Amino acid sequence: SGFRKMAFPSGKVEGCMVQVTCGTTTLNGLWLDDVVYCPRHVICTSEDMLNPNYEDLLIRKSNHNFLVQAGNVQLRVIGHSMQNCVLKLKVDTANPKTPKYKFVRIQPGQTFSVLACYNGSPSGVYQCAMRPNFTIKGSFLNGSCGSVGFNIDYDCVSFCYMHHMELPTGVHAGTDLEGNFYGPFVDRQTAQAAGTDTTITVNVLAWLYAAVINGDRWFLNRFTTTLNDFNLVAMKYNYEPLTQDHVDILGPLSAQTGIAVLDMCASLKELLQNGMNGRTILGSALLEDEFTPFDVVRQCS
Amino acid sequence: SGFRKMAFPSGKVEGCMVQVTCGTTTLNGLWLDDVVYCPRHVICTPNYEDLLIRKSNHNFLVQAGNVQLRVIGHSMQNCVLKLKVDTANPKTPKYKFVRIQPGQTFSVLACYNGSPSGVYQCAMRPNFTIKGSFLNGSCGSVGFNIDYDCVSFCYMHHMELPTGVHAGTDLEGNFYGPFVDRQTAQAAGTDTTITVNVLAWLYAAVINGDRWFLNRFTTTLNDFNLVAMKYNYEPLTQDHVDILGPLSAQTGIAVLDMCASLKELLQNGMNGRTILGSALLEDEFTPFDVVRQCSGVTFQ
Ligand SMILES: *[C@](O)(C(=O)NC1CC1)[C@H](CCC)NC(=O)[C@@H]1[C@H]2CCC[C@H]2CN1C(=O)[C@@H](NC(=O)[C@@H](NC(=O)c1cnccn1)C1CCCCC1)C(C)(C)C
Ligand SMILES: [Cl-]
Ligand SMILES: [Cl-]
Numbered sequence: 001s002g003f004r005k006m007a008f009p010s011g012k013v014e015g016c017m018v019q020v021t022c023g024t025t026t027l028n029g030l031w032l033d034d035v036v037y038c039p040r041h042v043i044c045t046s047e048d049m050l051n052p053n054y055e056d057l058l059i060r061k062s063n064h065n066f067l068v069q070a071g072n073v074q075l076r077v078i079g080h081s082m083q084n085c086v087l088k089l090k091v092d093t094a095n096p097k098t099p100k101y102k103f104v105r106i107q108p109g110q111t112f113s114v115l116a117c118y119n120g121s122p123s124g125v126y127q128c129a130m131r132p133n134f135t136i137k138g139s140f141l142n143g144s145c146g147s148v149g150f151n152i153d154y155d156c157v158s159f160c161y162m163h164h165m166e167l168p169t170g171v172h173a174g175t176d177l178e179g180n181f182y183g184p185f186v187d188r189q190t191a192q193a194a195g196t197d198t199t200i201t202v203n204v205l206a207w208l209y210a211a212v213i214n215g216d217r218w219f220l221n222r223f224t225t226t227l228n229d230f231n232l233v234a235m236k237y238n239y240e241p242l243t244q245d246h247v248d249i250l251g252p253l254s255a256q257t258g259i260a261v262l263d264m265c266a267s268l269k270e271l272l273q274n275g276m277n278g279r280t281i282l283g284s285a286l287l288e289d290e291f292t293p294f295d296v297v298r299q300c301s
Numbered sequence: 302s303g304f305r306k307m308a309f310p311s312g313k314v315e316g317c318m319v320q321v322t323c324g325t326t327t328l329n330g331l332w333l334d335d336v337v338y339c340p341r342h343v344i345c346t347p348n349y350e351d352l353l354i355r356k357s358n359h360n361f362l363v364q365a366g367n368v369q370l371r372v373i374g375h376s377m378q379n380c381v382l383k384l385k386v387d388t389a390n391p392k393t394p395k396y397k398f399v400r401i402q403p404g405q406t407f408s409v410l411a412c413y414n415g416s417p418s419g420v421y422q423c424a425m426r427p428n429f430t431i432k433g434s435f436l437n438g439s440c441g442s443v444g445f446n447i448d449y450d451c452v453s454f455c456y457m458h459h460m461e462l463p464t465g466v467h468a469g470t471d472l473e474g475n476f477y478g479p480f481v482d483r484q485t486a487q488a489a490g491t492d493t494t495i496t497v498n499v500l501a502w503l504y505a506a507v508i509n510g511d512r513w514f515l516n517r518f519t520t521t522l523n524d525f526n527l528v529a530m531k532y533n534y535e536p537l538t539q540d541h542v543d544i545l546g547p548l549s550a551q552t553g554i555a556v557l558d559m560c561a562s563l564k565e566l567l568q569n570g571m572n573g574r575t576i577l578g579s580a581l582l583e584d585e586f587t588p589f590d591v592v593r594q595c596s597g598v599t600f601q
Contacts, residue, residue, distance in 0.1 A: 004433070009311045009410060009418070118599050122599060123307075123600070125307065139303035141595075141597045171303075214465065283581075286580045
């Protein structure tokens with residue numbers, strides 16, 4: 001029993017972390033096989049972060065302008081290339097600690113573990129979600145760029161995030177491991193508005209199912225709703241629309257608990273109307289939206 | 302910016318986890334140097350001395366991945382089994398065994414069949430339980446802190462209590478709390494809130510720009526402790542005040558000034574507001590956890 005914000009064990013990722021220095025900029029890189037991946041803005045100066053011409057800056061660099069440190073060992077850079085907003089440094093050594101891995105681009109609502117690192121060394125591991133507005137609510141200080149997000153379903157590491165910047169509201173933006181930003185963001189210091197964030201409805205329902213599995217029934221009611229009436233109400237609380245895909249996805253937790261998906265929707269509608277009235281669900285006084293249907297089945301079964 | 306429930310990096314501990322099988326019971330062991338540690342209840346179907354006498358070394362199946370370890374010795378220490386093996390763990394980190402106090406936090410590496418499955422942060426509750434997340438097969442999962450490349454092992458998981466909270470031992474097999482490794486009736490005591498940790502988390506909030514709950518008021522240790530008692534909060538000691546000293550100095554909010562904030566929150570509630578995305582007063586971050594996370598301390 002119990003229900004925690006549970007991260008993946010970080011060891012497979014810790015053995016991939018290195019420090020990358022170009023100029024006076026030091027940040028983290030990810031060493032897989034004979035390639036180090038890091039944010040391309042490691043090549044930028046103070047005098048040019050508004051409108052950097054990355055192609056013009058990179059052509060001016062030598063392999064020897066990149067200092068790559070794995071523990072107290074310098075790796076030899078024998079080549080460099082840019083893929084979207086990630087820099088790929090070819091190095092003379094394959095990482096002997098390279099795990100089984102893949103690169104996956106995730107959808108809003110998906111969860112992943114972050115290993116927050118400084119100077120190529122890990123500080124901590126925590127759980128995050130890709131917000132509907134394509135930010136993440138991370139915990140990152142200066143130096144954390146090149147920290148990664150990952151899942152480890154079944155001994156294979158799925159890299160899904162690389163950290164690049166903090167927005168003025170204190171939330172975070174970054175790329176997949178192909179260097180494509182999540183959301184409308186660019187690696188420039190120009191002003192860039194994050195969309196209004198919304199609550200991940202399918203995740204809140206998954207968590208209510210986790211609560212029932214763990215023996216909490218207080219918030220259930222005798223009512224049902226149509227999907228369309230649910231979405232009309234939930235939109236008024238800045239909840240994401242629930243789609244038929246989401247209803248299908250909740251089918252197995254519905255089967256395990258014997259509570260129909262649109263019956264649980266009616267419970268959520270009442271909780272938005274009433275609040276908790278001094279009660280808690282799985283030790284929270286708020287409706288939690290950073291557990292996916294898959295995360296609930298992983299932790300509860 | 303940002304403030305998350307952050308665990309220690311788990312890599313040093315992942316390389317120590319093994320599967321222990323005795324008869325029909327499979328659970329987790331911790332492999333350090335040439336010894337595997339696990340709950341003594343692995344030998345059960347209790348008179349532990351007697352049950353153990355009847356076991357030869359080959360009764361204990363220890364697997365480190367798909368490699369069998371050879372057991373050459375077995376002894377009991379309190380409620381832990383120590384299995385001597387013929388090979389030292391070449392992945393043994395710098396470590397020590399420590400016994401923590403109620404209110405102290407640590408990371409749990411939840412494991413099944415000797416395989417790490419997840420990591421989370423929790424606190425030893427004032428009632429000596431932990432609010433963990435554990436299914437059948439999780440016994441022998443361990444809790445730990447890291448302090449500059451040294452792993453301090455503090456917890457080994459033994460059982461779930463009827464309310465769904467968890468009980469276990471230090472790595473010398475001494476239970477936290479008034480629990481026994483027996484199928485008899487046992488209950489979590491009334492729990493209380495870890496006051497010094499709530500104050501640390503309000504400092505984390507202020508560092509992260511969440512300031513609405515701050516007020517002009519200050520209090521006394523004596524006046525606040527009468528309010529703490531009233532709200533089933535642990536007493537705040539002068540040592541706790543001294544421990545929050547760095548956060549007082551960094552934020553400009555003295556501890557008894559923050560206590561007057563906490564009094565108002567206990568008396569009044571949060572009036573529809575949140576702190577660091579919580580509608581509850583969070584008590585599973587220590588002062589050291591807040592300094593750690595907000596200053597970017599790393600592990601070697
Ligand atoms: C990272 O590269 C790093 O760890 N570097 C090691 C120390 C040497 C670093 C992480 C900093 C917290 N990231 C950055 O420096 C990035 C790079 C890459 C893209 C832009 C630059 C600047 N930057 C930032 O994260 C900045 N963020 C911003 O400038 C945002 N704007 C504001 O925060 C802001 C605040 N008040 C008024 C006006 N603007 C913008 C917002 C829109 C998207 C782009 C970033 C700082 C300010 C350094 C956090
Ligand atoms: Cl996805
Ligand atoms: Cl969290």
